[PDB]
Amino acid sequence: DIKVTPGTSELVEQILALLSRYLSSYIHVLNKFISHLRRVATLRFERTTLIKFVKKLRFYNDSVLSYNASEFINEGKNELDPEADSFDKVILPIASMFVKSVETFDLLNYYLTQSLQKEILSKTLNEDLTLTAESILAIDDTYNHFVKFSQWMIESLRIGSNLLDLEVVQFAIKSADEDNIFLQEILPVNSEEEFQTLSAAWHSILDGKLSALDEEFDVVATKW
Amino acid sequence: TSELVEQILALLSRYLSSYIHVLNKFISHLRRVATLRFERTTLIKFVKKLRFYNDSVLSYNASEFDKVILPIASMFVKSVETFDLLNYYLTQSLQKEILSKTLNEDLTLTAESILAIDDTYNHFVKFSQWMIESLRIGSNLLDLEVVQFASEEEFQTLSAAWHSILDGKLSALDEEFDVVATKW
Numbered sequence: 001d002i003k004v005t006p007g008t009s010e011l012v013e014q015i016l017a018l019l020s021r022y023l024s025s026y027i028h029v030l031n032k033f034i035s036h037l038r039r040v041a042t043l044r045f046e047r048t049t050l051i052k053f054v055k056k057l058r059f060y061n062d063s064v065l066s067y068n069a070s071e072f073i074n075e076g077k078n079e080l081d082p083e084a085d086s087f088d089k090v091i092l093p094i095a096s097m098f099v100k101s102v103e104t105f106d107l108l109n110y111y112l113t114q115s116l117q118k119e120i121l122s123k124t125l126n127e128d129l130t131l132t133a134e135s136i137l138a139i140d141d142t143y144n145h146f147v148k149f150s151q152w153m154i155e156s157l158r159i160g161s162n163l164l165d166l167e168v169v170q171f172a173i174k175s176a177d178e179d180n181i182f183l184q185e186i187l188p189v190n191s192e193e194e195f196q197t198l199s200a201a202w203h204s205i206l207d208g209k210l211s212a213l214d215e216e217f218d219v220v221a222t223k224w
Numbered sequence: 225t226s227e228l229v230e231q232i233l234a235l236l237s238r239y240l241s242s243y244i245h246v247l248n249k250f251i252s253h254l255r256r257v258a259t260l261r262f263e264r265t266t267l268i269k270f271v272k273k274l275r276f277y278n279d280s281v282l283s284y285n286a287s288e289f290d291k292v293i294l295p296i297a298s299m300f301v302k303s304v305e306t307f308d309l310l311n312y313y314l315t316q317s318l319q320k321e322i323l324s325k326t327l328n329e330d331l332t333l334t335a336e337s338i339l340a341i342d343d344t345y346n347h348f349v350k351f352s353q354w355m356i357e358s359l360r361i362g363s364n365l366l367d368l369e370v371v372q373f374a375s376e377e378e379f380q381t382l383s384a385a386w387h388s389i390l391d392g393k394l395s396a397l398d399e400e401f402d403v404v405a406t407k408w
Contacts, residue, residue, distance in 0.1 A: 096298040163295035
């Protein structure tokens with residue numbers, strides 16, 4: 001139904017630029033932490049795990065920044081009947097990349113803010129090596145908003161399926177055995193113009209979450 | 225084509241269920257090794273995600289162009305990059321940590337289970353790469369990390385050969401999994 005226009009490739013690159021900024025922010029703070037952890041001999045193997053996760057995030061970020069949206073977008077001259085790309089089809093690969101990246105950040109956040117924190121305390125007692133409570137809060141907040149953004153893109157285009165579902169959203173749903181961001185906070189709507197508007201609002205909400213994250217990340221890296 | 229997508233997804237479900245099975249057993253056995261408490265919790269996080277993917281795939285009923293291929297390729301890519309993270313944690317970092325904390329080999333993986341884990345992974349990577357490239361749906365957003373460092377009958381025919389190769393690998397894997405589980 002909805003067809004791509006000559007502004008679509010721009011919109012896709014702006015959406016992907018947010019993901020690059022989210023990936024680049026972790027790359028930056030974890031590069032700094034991994035470098036500091038060279039001095040702590042008992043965290044040798046946690047350090048190699050974090051380096052694994054960083055290599056992956058850099059891989060995703062390098063892929064996002066290499067994507068030439070134009071290559072994958074066939075416009076018309078003005079709705080070339082059978083050949084202008086459908087909008088939902090142009091967004092699907094982007095939503096797919098968001099979903100895969102969100103599920104990585106779910107695993108990495110849990111390692112970095114739960115498991116590792118306890119392990120660092122258990123091995124060293126050293127609160128200087130831990131994240132601040134405000135950084136964990138900002139990590140969780142940003143993650144929840146990228147998850148909701150991703151749900152928003154997918155459901156507003158009706159491109160959703162079991163294969164594009166996020167763990168945390170399905171978990172919140174299934175917790176229907178009884179400020180509820182993922183939940184029956186539903187969504188509906190209806191043209192590329194209307195998509196562009198809501199994605200302009202989301203861009204601004206995500207850009208604010210990311211500046212806050214960066215600020216907390218700058219503060220914690222003070223300790224190192 | 226419908227029963228072909230169900231065949232491809234079933235291989236993915238078998239790969240996922242096989243890890244779910246052996247890690248559920250590992251996690252149980254770690255239940256009372258206090259020095260391994262927070263490692264056990266990270267494994268539980270990974271298993272919960274593999275369970276989630278598996279349930280997703282099993283619930284998916286093939287009944288719906290780009291809007292069929294791409295969610296499926298997307299699922300394989302996302303599953304593979306996860307097993308890439310989990311294999312590294314499970315066969316490298318955690319193995320060393322286990323040796324460092326316990327001082328013995330009673331909880332480690334066999335050298336053979338590790339070879340099987342890596343062999344299956346490498347075959348799922350080549351399989352995923354083969355499908356995506358042959359179906360000409362490749363993009364930076366579907367690339368696999370590891371592939372960076374390292375014709376109408378066509379699809380049907382190679383699918384068949386891969387289904388046979390993978391079925392074997394999966395069977396070898398699950399063999400080595402039973403072997404390490406008896407070791408514990």
